[PDB]
């Protein structure tokens, strides 16, 4: 749609031409800003292309769904869990490539102080993530189960 194009044009930070220009620059060295811009563009490009692969898989499985008149309940539940498994494999691939890029672009050593700072931030963010997850999912499932339980009691009272 039109609004999706306007919202994207109004948000664009990088072009493909800019990125190719940066990659192909005659400059012997490349600074952290330019490296971050390129990795942000690449992360985004790989994220979009991955989604197109998932669409193509789901379009293909749709042909089997229609051949065997498979109900939507089964189709959507299986598509949902497959999406999760594919995300899982993509994270594992990105993890290896981030480690590859980290070791290839830097020296053998890093300041222990800086490493300890990053590590303390990761640990604090995980505690914060876990607290939030507890509160969010406890409420999501409580409402869903309490509601379904009220619906059952209704059907039970009727009989």
Residues that bind Cl ion (CB under 5 A): 71, 74, 94, 97, 101-102, 106, 110
Closest approach, Cβ 6 to Cl ion, in A, equals: 30
34, 22 Cβ separation under 8 angstroms: yes
Residues in 74-133 at the binding interface with a copy of itself, rule: CB under 8 A: 74-75, 77-78, 80-82, 84-91, 93-95, 97-119, 121-123, 125-126, 129-130, 133
For a copy of itself (CB under 8 A), the number of binding residues is 91
Which has the closest alpha carbon to 63: 51, 49, 75? 75
- What 3-state DSSP class applies to 68? coil
Residues in 59-78 at the binding interface with a copy of itself, rule: CB under 8 A: 60-61, 64-65, 67-70, 74-75, 77-78
Closest approach, Cβ 4 to a copy of itself, in A, equals: 22
Contact letters for a copy of itself, residues 2-21 (x by CB under 8 A): --------------------
| Residue 41 in the binding site for a copy of itself (CB under 8 A) | no
Q: Return the number of the residue (6 or 118) whose C-beta is nearest a copy of itself.
A: 118
Q: Give the angle 62-63-69 at the CA atoms, nearest 5°.
A: 80
> SS3 sequence, 114-159?
HHHHHHHHHHHHHHHHHHHHHHHHHHHHHHHHHHHHHHHHHHHHHC
Task: Provide the 10 A C-beta neighbour count for residue 153.
Answer: 10
């Amino acid at each position: 749609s039109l609004s999706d194009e306007i919202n994207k044009c109004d948000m664009k930070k990088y072009t493909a031409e800019e990125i190719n220009e940066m990659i192909n620059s005659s400059n012997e060295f490349i600074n952290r800003n330019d490296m971050n811009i390129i990795f942000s563009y690449v992360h985004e490009s790989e994220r979009e292309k991955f989604k197109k692969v998932e669409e193509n898989i789901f379009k293909f499985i749709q042909s089997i769904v229609e051949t065997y008149k498979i109900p939507d309940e089964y189709k959507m539940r299986k598509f949902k869990f497959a999406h999760f498994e594919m995300q899982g494999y993509a994270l594992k691939q990105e993890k290896f490539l981030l480690e590859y890029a980290f070791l290839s672009l830097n020296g053998k050593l890093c300041e222990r102080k800086k490493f300890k700072e990053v590590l303390e931030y990761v640990k604090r963010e995980w505690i914060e993530f876990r607290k939030s997850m507890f509160d969010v999912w406890k409420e999501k499932l409580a409402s869903e189960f309490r509601e379904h339980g009220e619906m059952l009691n209704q059907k039970r009272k009727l009989k």
